Amino acid sequence: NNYSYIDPTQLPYDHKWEFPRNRLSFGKTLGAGGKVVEATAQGLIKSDAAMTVAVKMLKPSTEREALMSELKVLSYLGNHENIVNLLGACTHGGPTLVITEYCCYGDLLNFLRRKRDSFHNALDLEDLLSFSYQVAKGMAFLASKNCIHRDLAARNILLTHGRITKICDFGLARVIKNDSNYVDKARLPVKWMAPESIFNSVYTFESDVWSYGIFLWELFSLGSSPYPGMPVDSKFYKMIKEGFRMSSPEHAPAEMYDIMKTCWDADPDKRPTFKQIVQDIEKQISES
């Protein structure tokens, strides 16, 4: 048909975000997975002070576009408390850079790992509930803007001041207004992917929820690797398709495990929505 919902992520880069590279000074390397580095940015404030930011870059081609992808998606979504904030981008004379909010504690996965012994500036059950709650809200927001993240995991969740969680790395994110599915034609997070994504290459709101389930398992297991000791081979894919699922992690309240189980239903339609998840966790928090 000749009649289309316009996808904002496919529109041209809006130079409202453009930022002079002269006004950036690169610090330490912050991650590699491209790479992000800490920097100070002049002129982002009305009073014209310097502020600390995180800049996402590439090394000297599909990752070239994945960065442009991530940028247009962030630009499209706008600002939310539970998403890494886009602050600007450099696209002129030089390599493409993406400036975003700096999260002082880094990824949630290594945070839970550092804090694993201190558990029970320590960690306790109420923090993990909060992380549950915030991440589901950030996800419910993406779903509200017809966006699927497609790489939901503890490694892609940053923790900032105030124990606030932010979703980051939108390289694989898509906007699914026109079609109810998304079919892909790269390297992928198998142990976080829904079956229909592995077997038929389809991605939907329901497949993000599946990833959210695996994330909870990461979360209540204090940063343990999914399907521990299980290599990604033929043995793995069968067990998935036959219906086998991880068991409850050590510190997961029974009703939080019930949420993982419904996120892992082979039937996408029997999975809950992020809207429903946010309601569930909110009631669990109240009863305390």
Ligand SMILES: c1ccc(-c2cc3cc(-c4cn[nH]c4)cnc3[nH]2)cc1
């Ligand atoms: C210690 C070590 C590392 C960090 C840290 C990582 C990180 C990553 C992003 C990021 C932006 N886009 N994608 C990812 C932002 N801030 C960060 N901060 C903080 C304390």
